[model samples]
Target: DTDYDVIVLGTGITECILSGLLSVDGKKVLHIDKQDHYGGEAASVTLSQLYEKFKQNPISKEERESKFGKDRDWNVDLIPKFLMANGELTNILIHTDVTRYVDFKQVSGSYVFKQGKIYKVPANEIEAISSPLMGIFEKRRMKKFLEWISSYKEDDLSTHQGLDLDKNTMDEVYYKFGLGNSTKEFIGHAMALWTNDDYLQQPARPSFERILLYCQSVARYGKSPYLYPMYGLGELPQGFARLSAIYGGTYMLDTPIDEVLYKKDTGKFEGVKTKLGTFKAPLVIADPTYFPEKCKSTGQRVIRAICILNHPVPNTSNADSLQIIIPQSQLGRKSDIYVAIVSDAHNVCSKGHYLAIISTIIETDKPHIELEPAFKLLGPIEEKFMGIAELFEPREDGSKDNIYLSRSYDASSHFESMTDDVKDIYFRVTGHPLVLK
Candidate 1:
């Protein structure tokens, strides 16, 4: 029987938010995940679970003797990401009241790797002036740039400084401020969060907005611009799922879908078939993994190394939770390298252990070799696990089949891009933008 209004095929954070939003809009929704757990690629697991997933079975006696605490005490995130204090994802959480489902703690520090060393990202004028990342003359230039960004107003012509953000490229804007190459790299890659140099050739408006957002986020929480959930990022999806459930969305986990039912003549999704019965819906939303045939590989791969350590990452001032960015220029690569480290301060690991995740878009055939520069900064990793995930995008617009598909998660260490995808899918489904109010 045709029943639900929408059938969501995964419980990833992207699908969870869409389900939550649609359910809040009074649409009957059915959410199904092939996995037994809530988060698909972003699952948080115990120490034993992690070992099992990687096929490191029969864990050695030496490993068992390392005193990593009980398996239950570990809540290691497979896909670790930080929430920008004032970014789009935070707005979504607050708008949906999903914050009530979880608790958050500000990451202790943010740093950029430059010239074989790490330096804290200066968030204010005082820090910028004293920052070891720049020289006396360069600090003045940085201050000028920061002041302009802070005082920038799109409608206020007085603050424009004779340069139109819409017309000038970011490269030109940086040159206008007399910013050196090192300063530009950190500001663009570390603060603005640009993954590649393509942003340099684009209009300056977005970069200016991004820098302002970073400053605002840092100001909101004095330590760092990013925040992480108490347990792990997996809490995010579970929180949103709770929000959806409260609004009458149905959930089915550990349930295998027989196939997505479709009208052969019209080529429109009808619903999903399972062992129990057929559940019908006019629309279907899923992550890339659900429709392999429909998703095309982007030929890009994300390489990640999950490291367990007994010490804090070198050069982070011994901060318990930190985010480190290694700009592409520092390593002579096309994509920036990201390092996220969390200790028991956030309750992701045992008291003496820290979890450091290093990731980047793979640019060469040797994936592990590409991560070597960041890996060396972790000091001595007690245990390490590595993986390379393929990137995928949907082939056709869902308008033809009523089967919306989400792109695979990228290599970025933040949720900004992911939230953009969620909002886009929401608009596509409803033919109207998702207005928080």
Candidate 2:
């Protein structure tokens, strides 16, 4: 006989839901992870106890006041909602309200590059057009395209039903939208750099559609109560763990699963044999990339890495701003390099520190991939004065110029293989049902 009614492997967000639900039903539930700590890839590393530490004085209120201003129009609040996906017969979680979450102000900045630099425009709308990145015609076309998308009926959106967004690659999407060749070169490099693969190698239609969907989501809800964890993303899993414990669920860490034993005659999972002990259960949930062949599912593994920088940078651009970067050679390389300025002069880090998070995505199980070095204009202010005419030279040294870095890799693929019941099991426990429509 099984010791518990259900057992879950991994302490990911998904597992938190699974174990949580079973416990709510009054069934004994146990969850375990191979790692010593919780939070798969979204973990954080601190330098307080590290060997090398640097400190900067805090920003004074006068300094903060001079650098920042408040605006009633900038107030925003967002609540998470479920939106339906096409053909999925389910609703996915998303944030629908954001007007209350954002604080916006008119600010000036600079962008510096090897070739030249310029004064960043202060006005948001004017800066969009004044930047030399695109010609007047391209800018006008982009504006028109965005305006069209804004008014398009929800049923017509390609969110649930995958539809061709016109371009086979992200580049093609822009090309079809009337972006000029020069503009394509710049944006293409961005796509190639972001995905770290060639755009041509990816799905032509779905890729662009996905990009557009994310953009729309951000534009619609970027300003919600989207607060980051005080120390690191590690806080998220801890919060989930607390929730699970309150519901009577048990969590185990640093205990890797040696194997999952399945019982065929009963058409049920018997138990998981780990280093600690044999855990028998009527049901089992996992969050690995490959479901054991014994489980009967087609699973694919993908690689995800998060690089956290010490001391934050200001006004960093990111995937939320552009989809992907395509290279200039026309060979079809792609990248999703997200740049964000984590620390601004006004909102300095606790000890005069600033931080940035760079994440990369790729297929898993392949040989370890080394991060390629990249360069960008240091600041946006300089880029505006010279127009889109700025140029970046490759950094000779492999070292980062202004920020400290920490890295992590997510190798699990099983999370995507979760059965419908597993998802339902999650919602039943959390009081938050998974919704797509």
Model 2 stretches with alpha carbons more than 4 Å out:
1-5, 17-28, 40-42, 48-130, 154-177, 181-212, 220-227, 254-261, 264-268, 273-278, 287-350, 357-437
Top-TM-score structure, candidate number: 1
Model 2 C-alpha lDDT per residue in residues 235-352, reported as the tens digit of each score: 4356556655765666888888787676776544677777778888655555432132223222322222222233223333321111112131332223232222233321323333
Overlapping backbone residue pairs in candidate 1 total 0
Each model's number of backbone clashes?
0, 69
RMSD of each: 1.6, 13.4
Off by over 4 Å in 1: 55-62
lDDT value for candidate 2? 0.37
TM-scores of the candidates in the order shown:
0.96, 0.51
Model 2 lDDT at residue 286:
59
Error of 2 at 406 (Å): 24
